[PDB]
Amino acid sequence: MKWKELVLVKDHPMKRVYIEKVVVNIGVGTGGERLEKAANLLRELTGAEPSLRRAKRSIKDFGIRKGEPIGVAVTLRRDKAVEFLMRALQAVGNRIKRSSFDERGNVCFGIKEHIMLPGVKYDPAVGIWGMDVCVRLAKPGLRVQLRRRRRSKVGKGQLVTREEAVEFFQKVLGVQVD
């Protein structure tokens, strides 16, 4: 059950649906050392180097200025995504609300604290952290909207829909969708 064989194939070879990428985010308020603990958690949780996310504006009521890092997110692809996604689903219990699916084939669910994930330990040093896990599904041909030269729009029939997203999570990932 690896990334290359996790594919929902319909009656056309090029209309297959796969996990394009999985993005894990942690929104911490201000601190660097507080961020540093969250940055260390993501590196050891996912095995991938997380990137600091800087504030887009200066919000006085949150005590954040534009340009300082207030976020740590890492995007996961191919096999690191599938491996971590399986753990994340277990921490929730193979349950995802139906309303959590968007019309364009994105699924995001939250993790209130990271201990429910298998393979992690309650540590009084890192503390307790929440997580946002977003999964993107894509049919082949998404490069048409992302390449540098001759960028254009992908046809409507080649885009992942909400119904194809729920089916992928149920039929391929074996997840209870409610």
Partner RNA sequence: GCCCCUAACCCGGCCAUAGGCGCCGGUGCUACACCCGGUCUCAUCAGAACCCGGAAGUUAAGGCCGGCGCCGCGCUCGGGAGUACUGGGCUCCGCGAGGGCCCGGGAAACCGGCGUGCUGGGAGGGGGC
Give yes or no for residue 21 binding RNA (CB under 7 A): yes
DSSP string computed for the chain: --GGG--B--SSGGG-BEEEEEEEEEE--S-HHHHHHHHHHHHHHHSS--EEEE-SS-BTTTTB-TTSEEEEEEEE-HHHHHHHHHHHHHHHTSEE-GGGB-TTSEEEEEESSGGGSTT----TTT----EEEEEEEE-TTGGGGTSSSS--PPPGGGSPPHHHHHHIIIIIS--EE-
Give yes or no for residue 77 binding RNA (CB under 7 A): yes
Q: Which stretch binds RNA (CB under 7 A): 92-100, 109-117, 125-133, 148-156?
A: 148-156
Site string for RNA, 32-71 (x = CB under 7 A): ----------------xxxx--------------------
Q: Which is nearer to RNA, 39 or 177 (CB)?
A: 39
Binder to RNA among 32, 63, 127, 140 (CB under 7 A)? Answer: 140
